[PDB]
Amino acid sequence: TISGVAVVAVMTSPGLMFNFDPYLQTRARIEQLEKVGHPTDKIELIIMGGTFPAREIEYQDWFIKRCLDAMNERESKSLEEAQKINETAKHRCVALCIETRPDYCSEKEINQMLKLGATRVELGVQSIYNEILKLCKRGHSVEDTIKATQLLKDSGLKVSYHLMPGMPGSSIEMDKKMFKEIFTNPDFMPDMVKIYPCLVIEGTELYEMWKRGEFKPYREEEAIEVISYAKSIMPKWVRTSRIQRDIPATVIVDGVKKSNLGELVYKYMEKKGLRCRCIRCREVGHVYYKKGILPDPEHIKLVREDYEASGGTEIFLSFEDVKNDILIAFLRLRDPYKPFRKEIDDKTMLVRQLHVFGWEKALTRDIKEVSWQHMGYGRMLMKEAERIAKEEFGKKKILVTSGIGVREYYRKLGYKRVGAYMGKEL
């Protein structure tokens, strides 16, 4: 399926073909997507490596600047100028995701990520059990994950967890309990999870453990059982990544090698009667592609679900066909717990995300182009968020975490730049 948002994933320096040049990587991906008719007016930029927040600030600012230069199609004098230019460019950076180790997620680093324009942070959690983390000689603790998650949430950012079932020392039941805990213990409650079973790749510590007879990775059966469980209990407010990996099968010494693990999980869940209600399974574009149906307007409602997370309250607002369970748009509103950013006080509510599922060329059906943007759903969710913030929680200002290329949208709704955010006085 072709999405309206182009994902541009780039690699930082210690990809290979361009010597890790940020501009060349970004440009090459955009041109490659244009070659196949994919829209590139909206770009999600993903910074891969996991060590980016530990690099020199000089390097971080330059790297992001040059990615934006490629989107803007012109040179700039500074990061700030490239960001300003990009607000009205032909290729707008609507989201910026930074991958990082949980222990590289201090207040100082979060300040830097906000300066860069980040909207999402993916934590290399892997496991929530310190026994497993220490056994595999990982460089972080679950305490690091818990603290990073709270600091990110209280700064308005989206939080994703990379999780690895089947690590040394774990078990099917241990993995299942981990997923239950991540969605029902307020220390965690991520917005998004990226799941793939632990693999044995030559040259890693996991390879050494495997060589010694300390590690037998999951085969397909076990991975399917764990991931199927995880999806069956995922809350409606959790977004999941397409189950896959960019690692070719010839480098996998041991572990799951087949390329359709996601499809195998789907068929397993069908066989067992396991339903999935998370964002990816219910979003309008995915439902049309998988099941050939569209939202029934007689049954579209504004729905609300609250949960406790990182000491505060998350409000998940959505427009949904509640007869067919099809998700059209959603907004993540947070009453923060212990913020540190200068622009967030105890009378502030945070809009951490607004997403209206938009254009999408489903090549395999007959209704070619389908979209729910420009129909009012985004504006209606914002109005409801403002009402809740003011009337129910007594807040006086609301701050939106906005992609660089989305600021203009919030300006139309009366918001103005407040530090790193778009803000409105209630």
Residue numbers in the entry: 74 to 87, 123 to 534
What does the primary publication say about this deposited structure?
Elp3 acts as the catalytic subunit, but the loss of any of the six subunits results in hypo-modified U34 tRNAs in yeast, indicating that the complete integrity of the complex is important for its function. The enzymatically active Elp3 subunit of Elongator contains two functional domains, utilizes multiple cofactors, and conducts a unique uridine base modification specifically found only at the wobble base position of tRNAs. The two domains form a cleft that contains several highly conserved basic residues, which bind and accommodate the tRNA anticodon stem loop (ASL). The current model of a radical based Elp3-mediated cm5-modification reaction is proposed as follows (i) Elp3 recruits SAM and cleaves it to generate a 5’deoxyadenosine radical (5’-dA) in the rSAM domain, (ii) Elp3 hydrolyzes acetyl-CoA in the KAT domain and (iii) an acetyl radical is formed by the products of the two domains and (iv) is transferred onto the C5 position of U34 in the bound tRNA molecule.
Although DmcElp3 and Methanocaldococcus infernus Elp3 (MinElp3) share 50% sequence identity, MinElp3 harbors an extended N-terminus (aa 1–75). We further generated five different N-terminally truncated versions (MinElp3Δ1–19, MinElp3Δ1–41, MinElp3Δ1–46, MinElp3Δ1–54, MinElp3Δ1–68) to facilitate crystallization. We used full length and truncated versions of purified MinElp3 in crystallization trials and obtained well-diffracting crystals for monomeric MinElp3Δ1–19, MinElp3Δ1–46, and MinElp3Δ1–54. We solved their structures using a poly-alanine model of DmcElp3 via molecular replacement at 1.9 Å, 1.9 Å, and 2.1 Å resolution, respectively. Although all three versions contained various lengths of the N-terminus and also showed no signs of degradation, we could observe interpretable electron density only starting from residue V72 in all collected and refined datasets. Therefore, we believe that the N-terminus adopts a highly flexible conformation in the absence of substrate tRNAs. The overall structure and domain arrangement and interface between the rSAM and KAT domains of MinElp3 are almost identical to DmcElp3. The main difference relates to the Fe–S cluster loop region (aa 87–123) and the Fe–S cluster itself, which were both completely unstructured in all monomeric MinElp3s. In our MinElp3 structures, we could not locate any bound Zn-ions and instead observed the formation of a disulfide bond between C384 and C389. In addition, we observed that the acetyl-CoA blocking loop (aa 466–486) is positioned outside of the acetyl-CoA binding pocket, interacting with the last visible residues of the N-terminus and also contacting a neighboring symmetry mate.
